[PDB]
């Protein structure tokens, strides 16, 4: 076996940065995007692409059928995110905090239920959610990023407590200003590391939990943020 | 001053609780519940009612009208609310608990603000859950959308703070508006469940001028319950 | 059954405010402080005081003996704490560090073990702390205060799992900004309530925690800060 | 001669998690520099090709002596990695004055004291990592490790307060935080309470460690990050 990554939402940012780099370590990979570009990634990385949307059951089933039916495992899913709703916090209408959950909640639920019969069948395997550092010291400027990601850290425990009897692990990586997007002076400034950090970073504490290294970590939102948030 | 409550969900439970003890502290209270149990009470109460749906806007909006014209103000609104395999939860039924658990404090708290702006003085208080930061399979969908309820009220705080509006969540582990079982009341350190006089004895606290420097905060009220500091 | 409330670090601040306000609730008061400011308070409100330091097992034991042998309970015990060390990090000396946890943590530990037996024959007790709301959101500022409250927060936590069944309760209260010292503009400003908290304010949270009302709460860290610590 | 070869001290490095520690780092390229107070160190670190003290990690002279060595040696100190002994463990009230000033000595000050020392070099290099061991019951604690918890929770607002006062030199400091490790004999009754239901091997930590001390991970600072199998409750 060599073993098997897919990222939903892997056509950009990072997404794209985690499938270059669990390439890289020798994972073969599956990407969705509803990009075009999730598929020329996934043919230069020598893996397999899906074009189609992360909040549609039926795109995600193709996905992980096709992995299957090519490699017949599953180790590792990455899902990455769109961007949702920003209002101030009372004026996000209800409609709007549902399309909320399913940009930044649900993009992790629907590919998770799919992947955990393999993954059960393996007594193996590693879920990692891209989230924010923001999602417990929330901000006016994501308001239904952090919301939705604060809901996703109480499902990922209850996940986490579920599955681990399996073998079956699954954590948040919580990034702060990343070079994804362009810079401003004053984010910067904010940060006490005094830079943006970079996608490449990312993608390196999604490929540490999932090595086997990280084997013993389950149920945790890890904070990559070059300091920026304020709680121990 | 005659100062004005309005509860959500307070036909039973720990909404009933909060109305009565809000009552008795002095407060003209107003009460929304679907079954029409917080109408009766409120009439008990020498308040008013409303029974209609707490994730209807119309519902809503007739409750908080009623109370402007009766009392001309909205000093205090308390939010209460109404178990499955973590994967078998479908999409439907994660919109669903989003609604019951989450959208149900958010929707009332737009309708009583601009009064409270007025004022330059509110108290929102949501009855929420221990699990919130520390669930269980047990409640997947409430501590799911109650954590989510967290971080939308610490964002409320920032933004209403210097108008003098505050917003806290009181987070109860086993109270006695169930019955017990030995496990469940043997897992709490006081081995006992909680009082639902003793929530509504928070949510009283948390709605007067003592407590009026706290903010943003979730308080387990739970017997030692859950184990985080 | 006339209830009693110890209060250490009651001659001035928030101390003081606590034993006024316990006071005002009905309590009977006894006193500690380095200053003649806890007798003077205590011989005021009918109480009796010790001028004494809340480092010291002798000082402690009398307040304590003299409480009993007055009223034969002791309900209530508040902890306010003096200053403690403030440098830059790393300059922060062993020694500093150790008188930092006299300052800071056995002030709180002190008290607690010689007031306990009474709790535990009356089956009832509350214990307050009054801590900081930096304590996981530590500034430079503070440093002693707030690793020595963090670990404070610890013991609370060890502390009330070990008496709950005994119908004994600690809780800390972790005040922001309070009217205790005078404002500066950037602190005021920094704190969203764009006010500093009153005395009174960290008294009537003191006065909620000593009521019936409260008994279901223990082990409990609960920020009174006006929305200044970022974490929900 | 044509990259950096960068430099590793371990304290409490002679058993448990600290040698796993040390152990990884060597096979990653560190140069590895080993405080134990037994004979353990020395010949762990020869056997790494790597120095070491005897000595403790409660005295300012032997870590000091540490810290000229391997200055002395290689010119540089780019990881600490600090590990701890054991502390008292008694009724939360009958813990002694005396007993909570040991525990401050050995799981605070232990971490504290190295800071100070390594802290000149990695300014002059505008780059450093300090690791330090901790503990899954830190902001969980529990009646079996009282001055553990209660130190380790110190020792994380301590961690806060460094990493952001350094944050602009590149010079970080996180906190690793075990749950039930291979490292100490095992008992069913902890084995069956981790939902993973097993123990975490000193490798697993070690690969934690190895982690943290990579480049790929030099966006993370002030952080505590449990190791424990899903032990823990709070999110």
């Known amino acids: 076996i ?3 990554a897919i990222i939903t939402a892997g056509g ?10 669990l390439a890289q370590d020798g994972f073969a990979v599956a990407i969705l995007s509803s990009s075009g570009k999730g598929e020329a990634l996934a043919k230069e990385l020598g893996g397999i692409g899906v074009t189609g949307s992360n909040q549609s059951n039926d795109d995600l089933q193709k996905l992980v059928d096709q ?19 920003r209002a101030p916090i009372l004026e996000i209408t209800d409609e709007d905090w549902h399309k909320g959950m399913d940009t930044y909640f649900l993009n992790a639920v629907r590919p998770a239920r799919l992947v955990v019969p393999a993954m059960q069948k393996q007594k193996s395997g590693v879920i990692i959610n891209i989230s924010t550092a923001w999602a417990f010291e929330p901000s006016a400027m994501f308001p239904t990023s952090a919301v ?8 990922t425990k209850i996940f986490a407590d579920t599955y681990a009897a399996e073998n079956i692990r699954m954590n948040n990586v919580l990034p702060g200003w990343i070079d994804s997007l362009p810079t401003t002076e004053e984010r910067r400034e904010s ?9 490449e970073e990312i993608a390196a504490t999604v490929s540490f939990l999932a090595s086997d290294g ?10 990559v943020d070059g300091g920026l948030t304020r709680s121990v």
């Open 214 to 223: 990280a084997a013993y970590i389950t149920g945790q939102n890890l904070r």
């Open 2 to 4: 060599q073993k098997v």
């Open 67 to 85: 992995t299957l039916e090519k490699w017949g495992r599953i180790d590792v899913l990455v899902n990455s995110a769109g961007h949702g709703p």
């Open 148 to 155: 939705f990601r604060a809901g996703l850290a109480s499902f």
């Open 191 to 199: 940060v006490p590391m005094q830079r943006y950090g970079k996608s």
């Open 12 to 21: 950009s940012g990072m997404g794209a940065a985690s499938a270059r780099r």
